[PDB]
Design a protein around this nucleic acid. Structure first.
Ligand SMILES: Nc1nc2c(ncn2[C@@H]2O[C@H](COP(=O)(O)OP(=O)(O)O)[C@@H](O)[C@H]2O)c(=O)[nH]1
Ligand SMILES: [Mg+2]
Ligand SMILES: [Mg+2]
Ligand SMILES: [Mg+2]
Ligand SMILES: [Mg+2]
Ligand SMILES: [Mg+2]
Ligand SMILES: [Mg+2]
Ligand SMILES: [Mg+2]
Ligand SMILES: [Mg+2]
Ligand SMILES: [Mg+2]
Ligand SMILES: [Mg+2]
Ligand SMILES: [Mg+2]
Ligand SMILES: [Mg+2]
Ligand SMILES: [Mg+2]
Ligand SMILES: [Mg+2]
Ligand SMILES: [Mg+2]
Ligand SMILES: [Mg+2]
Ligand SMILES: [Mg+2]
Ligand SMILES: [Mg+2]
Lengths: 122, 161, 401, 136, 96
RNA sequence: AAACUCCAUAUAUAUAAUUUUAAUUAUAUAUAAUUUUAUAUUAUUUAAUAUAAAGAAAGGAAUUAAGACAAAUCAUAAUGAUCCUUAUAAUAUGGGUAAUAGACGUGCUAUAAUAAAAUGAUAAUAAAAUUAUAUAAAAUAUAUUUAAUUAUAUUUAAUUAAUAAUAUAAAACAUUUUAAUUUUUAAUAUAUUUUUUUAUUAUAAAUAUGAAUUAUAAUCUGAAAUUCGAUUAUAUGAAA
């Protein structure tokens, strides 16, 4: 299980020939942006194991890019079980780190998190 | 007791020599970010890649590499940065540029030169401009030359030398 | 402030219409023939010259494809996708297909292959690429009195011209007429001299009939006559095809307005009605081997109609006319349309495509140099969503990410 | 019949009673069952074959329950009539149910059964001291 | 909607008859929404509180034995007395 | 001050007969870091940089001392002094707080093609929060010949709530269109660019931008919409 922003991705990674199913449908159908797909691939790409592992991702919450990132995160963790020696390498690549970047709340006086309303001197 | 299997060990060994692959071409990503405006990165990406495709079609050789070369050519290696100079004459100094800054300068010029082209779609205009630069024709080059000349004046205004 | 040479169009238009196929490597590839598929079963194949000529006229090669990448438009033969479809076409008694699949899977390409096959095997082809033109209201129309439907005599003329040119004249002029035909003349010459043009039964030909040039109000009559003639003749097979048939299914009512301000129904038009008649068991062609091959487009809208027509969903009666038109379904059921799902690419096929692209010199330097080939292929397969050809192509060429 | 009671408080929802039945569990013939379902309309869900209805019209809970019961009985009587009123040719309106489904989310998808690898699963590792211990 | 309209209307009428709910096929303003609205008056009335609450007056009634002192009242009385003393007392009220 | 605190994060345990299910969750209780270790390179046993291996380990909120500004508040409320007590206290009906020369802040909408509009039902993808002084689903009717959309009416299914409703999130992405633009159209031919090409004919500073201002008709809330409210339609289409 991986997470990012509001997204949560439970991912079943298995040893069969490399095909993808995100949330009960084809990968290109779910993630339209190629960037998201590339991100998802990256854990399998740092290893030479894209094509080796079948991946069945199941996402919930957040938006598409965040969902894709959460899936990627989950996949790295799943891969780590298959061969523990690659764990360090995955960590170095920056896939085993849970991306903490959390949406800042709207503070009272400010318009958004940081965006304050205009100041005046006179 | 860890117990690593033989096949796993062999796989790890095979991996060890290979370096970790880069997630982005950095210069391209920077360019896409600069193009982008309202957190609408996807649109900027589409624009850029479409332009590069067009460039490739016009002149059949790696478009990214050609763009990088163009940037290298165009990017002025230093800039005559102005200073207050302790409340006196504003004595300008040549200052070396970071890679991003170098390519940022180039990109703005490229964008400007594209904006003079005809089409409605900016991506097309951009691609035409990139092809022209690859072939070797722009006012951007002239501007760079001028900048270099201005840097050459003020030789020893550099402080540490 | 524009020159002839400069590119003024938007991107997709530019790629279609500015000939950047000019600067491309010549490739001595094998030729597409159904009789010798055993030789070139899973290989890229350029079309024959005659096929190309026919295919362009028909309107098979489309704008949003990457046909600009090569000297001419190119496909590969596929055992699971194209070859199987061809076999079905050959074998089946009804010979009546609708090419379904996900967006970018290669339905048009399948259609183009089917057209090419028909050309090879001495068949006439009536292709209607993009029914949007006749369905959406962007050309003149008129209510004919004899035929109780709205004719469209700009589109119709174009369609007639396409029919004339796509097909060879020897095959087309082998057909003698069943009836005599009077038409209004509309030449620059013989306007005052010949007020009417007359085609006789045995003496005249289908080619001659096609070449007739009337006023707009007789154009629909001419079209009707031609269709009838083609239905009657048993000497040559007639391949009817409609690509982006999804639009037709969904756009039940056209943008045209009759005398009272309300939208005209698709079946109240000439073209759409004719098309529907061809689809169904109604305008039955005399010859065997005479097929209708429809094709969906992911571009267009999706709704309950097409699934209901096929063996997919039970008929919900309460869903709206907008999301389910039952007349169209009924028509589809009447003419036994067996659907054909275009399968996504296998790993081997993808590899073969990638190899071809490399040969043609489309691949980027970062893909080729300093990378294992099998690994690259696997990555490409992954990024396409396990072998969506268009998506794969986009990842290969239009990525730059 | 589900009743609700707020202990310390005097809520006005304590009067609310909710009857709920599976329609196949009701003693009906097939024609009559269909008619009953048609009569129910929005109250009958079709995915789960369940018909429920709540009444808050009356002051007390018991009253409301009685009213609900009476309604149910009336519905049953109507279903079992069949005299010059069959409702054989009015299909089941399932629009409310599809709207509800749309409002909610679905997890219908499952792991492909042919993707499974029982051979790759971790086999039982031999623990000798445990085996020795197990003398019972 | 291939299913006929009249039949659907009849079904709807029957359903309405079965339950208590009314059947308005024409779609005319009946006035149902005026009466059917739950009346909110008692809750509105109960806004400020329970007027019968114990006061200092009662703390003499309940417990005469205990000589209680209301402090605020006593203070007020002292203030009044002070005002009277220094010629700042209230003027005598007109009757007419 | 820092720290303990809250939110968020990672892990563990517990509980939930996995129909109130979202277990990819929720919530109690812990543990976790103001991270650690080592090799080197500069400056003097340590401290900054770099490299490496170990880790999920990276933020936000609350808290803003003493004094000062006779800073703000007697219109949250209370109290001192002072003034009013048939009036400066109390109730009703209407009007005003919304007046308009110029001026000053904050915003909103704009001035079109790296940007606007149509469409997108096996309904692409969220979170947080509200619903007994209620939330109002489906469906029918009218605006509107199909229907959808949007707006009202008709009438209340369900739920006072991890159960039903507010509510199919929207950008995104895709096709289509887009004046300025003879950078297009349509009549002919033309053809291996056919949702298109070429040839020759005719196509002659605010729009198919913007939405101020106004006219009429309806609808909504309320007992009541004139001063003075909110929608929808048909027109109006400033400035920029
Ligand atoms: N089957 C097949 N398809 C190809 C080949 N080469 C390219 N294609 C792709 O096929 C696509 C056509 O798919 P289509 O189903 O018409 O897309 P749709 O119009 O969205 O339905 C194009 O986008 C091409 O990129 C090929 O050799 N075989
Ligand atoms: Mg298509
Ligand atoms: Mg502190
Ligand atoms: Mg669950
Ligand atoms: Mg202080
Ligand atoms: Mg003061
Ligand atoms: Mg003060
Ligand atoms: Mg006071
Ligand atoms: Mg007071
Ligand atoms: Mg008073
Ligand atoms: Mg005010
Ligand atoms: Mg302010
Ligand atoms: Mg605009
Ligand atoms: Mg509704
Ligand atoms: Mg709900
Ligand atoms: Mg939606
Ligand atoms: Mg102006
Ligand atoms: Mg406007
Ligand atoms: Mg607007």
């Amino acid at each position: 299980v991986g997470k990012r922003k509001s997204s949560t991705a439970k991912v079943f990674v298995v040893r069969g020939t490399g095909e993808i199913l995100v949330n009960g449908r084809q990968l290109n159908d779910y993630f339209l942006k190629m960037k998201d797909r590339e991100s998802i691939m990256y854990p399998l790409q740092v290893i030479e194991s894209v094509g080796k592992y079948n991946i069945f991702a199941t996402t919930s919450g957040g938006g598409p890019t965040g969902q894709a990132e959460s899936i990627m995160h989950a996949i790295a963790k799943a891969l780590v079980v298959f061969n523990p020696l690659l764990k360090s390498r995955l960590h170095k690549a920056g896939v085993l780190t849970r991306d903490y970047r959390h949406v800042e709340r709207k503070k009272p006086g400010k318009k958004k998190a940081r965006k304050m309303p205009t100041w005046v001197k006179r | 007791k860890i117990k690593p299997t033989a096949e796993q060990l062999a796989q790890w060994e095979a991996l060890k020599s290979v370096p970790i692959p880069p997630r982005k071409n950095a210069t391209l990503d920077h360019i896409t970010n600069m193009i982008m405006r309202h957190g609408k990165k996807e649109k900027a990406q589409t624009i850029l890649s479409r332009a590069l495709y067009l460039v490739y079609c016009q002149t059949r050789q790696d478009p990214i590499q050609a763009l990088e070369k163009s940037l290298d050519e165009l990017a002025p290696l230093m800039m005559t940065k102005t200073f207050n100079t302790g409340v006196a004459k504003a004595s300008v100094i040549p200052v070396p540029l970071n890679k991003r800054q170098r390519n940022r300068i180039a990109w703005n010029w490229i964008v400007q030169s594209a904006n003079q082209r005809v089409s409605s779609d900016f991506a097309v205009r951009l691609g035409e401009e990139l092809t022209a630069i690859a072939k070797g024709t722009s006012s951007a080059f002239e501007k760079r030359d001028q900048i270099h000349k201005t840097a050459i004046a003020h030789r020893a205004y550099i402080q540490l030398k | 402030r524009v020159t002839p040479g400069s590119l003024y169009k938007n991107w997709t238009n530019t790629t279609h219409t500015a000939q950047l196929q000019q600067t491309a490597v010549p490739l001595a590839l094998p030729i597409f023939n159904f009789d010798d598929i055993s030789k070139t079963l899973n290989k890229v194949v350029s079309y024959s010259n005659k096929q190309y000529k026919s295919l362009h006229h028909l309107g098979s090669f489309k704008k949003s494809q990457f046909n600009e990448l090569f000297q001419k438009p190119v496909c590969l033969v596929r055992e699971d996708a194209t070859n199987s479809f061809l076999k079905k076409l050959v074998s089946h008694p009804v010979k009546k297909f609708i090419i379904t699949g996900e967006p970018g899977v290669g339905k048009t390409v399948l259609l183009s292959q089917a057209h090419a096959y028909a050309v090879d095997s001495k068949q006439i082809i009536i292709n209607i690429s993009y029914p949007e033109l006749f369905l959406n209201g962007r050309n003149d129309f008129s209510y004919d009195d004899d035929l109780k439907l709205f004719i469209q005599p700009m589109y119709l003329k174009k369609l007639i011209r396409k029919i004339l040119k796509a097909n060879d004249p020897a095959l087309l002029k082998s057909i003698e007429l069943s009836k005599d035909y009077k038409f209004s003349n509309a030449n620059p010459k013989n306007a005052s001299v010949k007020p009417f043009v007359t085609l006789n039964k045995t003496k005249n030909t289908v080619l001659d009939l096609l070449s007739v040039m009337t006023h707009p109000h007789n154009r629909g009559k001419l079209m009707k006559a031609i269709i009838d003639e083609l239905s009657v003749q048993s000497k040559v097979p007639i391949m009817f095809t409609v690509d982006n048939f999804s639009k037709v299914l969904t756009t039940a009512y056209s943008a045209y307005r009759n005398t009272e301000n309300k939208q005209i129904y698709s079946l109240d038009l000439q073209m759409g009605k004719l098309m529907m008649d061809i689809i169904s068991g109604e305008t039955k062609f005399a010859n065997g081997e005479s097929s209708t091959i429809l094709a969906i487009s992911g571009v267009d809208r999706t709704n309950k109609t097409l699934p209901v027509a096929l063996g997919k969903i039970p008929v919900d009666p309460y869903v709206t006319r907008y999301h389910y038109e039952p007349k169209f379904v009924e028509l589809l059921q009447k003419g036994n349309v067996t659907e054909f799902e275009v399968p996504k690419l296998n790993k081997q096929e993808v590899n073969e495509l990638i190899d071809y692209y490399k040969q043609s010199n489309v691949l980027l330097d970062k893909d080729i140099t300093g990378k294992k080939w099998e690994n690259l292929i696997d990555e490409k397969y992954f990024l396409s969503g396990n072998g969506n050809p268009r998506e794969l192509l986009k990842s290969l060429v239009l990525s730059h990410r | 019949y589900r009743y609700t009671s707020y202990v310390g408080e005097e809520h006005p929802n304590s009067r609310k009673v909710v009857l709920s039945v599976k329609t196949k569990e009701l003693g009906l013939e097939e024609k009559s069952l269909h008619k009953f379902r048609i009569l129910a309309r929005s109250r009958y869900d079709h995915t789960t074959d369940i018909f429920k209805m709540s009444s808050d019209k009356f002051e007390h809970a018991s009253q409301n329950a009685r009213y609900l019961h009476d309604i149910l009985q009336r519905l049953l009587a109507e279903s079992k009539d069949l005299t010059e009123d069959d409702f054989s040719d009015v299909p089941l309106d399932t629009r409310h149910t599809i709207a509800k489904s749309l409002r909610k989310k679905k997890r219908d998808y499952e792991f492909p059964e042919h993707w499974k690898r029982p051979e790759d699963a971790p086999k039982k590792k031999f623990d000798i001291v445990d085996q020795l211990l197990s003398t019972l | 909607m291939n299913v006929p309209k009249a039949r659907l209307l009849k079904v709807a009428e029957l359903s309405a008859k079965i339950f208590d709910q009314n059947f308005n096929p024409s779609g005319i303003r009946t006035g149902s929404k005026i009466l059917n609205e739950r009346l909110k008056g008692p809750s509105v009335a109960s806004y400020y509180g329970n007027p019968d609450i114990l006061k200092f007056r009662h703390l003499k009634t309940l417990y005469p034995d205990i000589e209680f002192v209301d402090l605020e009242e006593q203070y007020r009385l002292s203030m009044v007395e002070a005002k009277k003393r220094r010629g700042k007392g209230a003027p005598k009220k007109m009757k007419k």
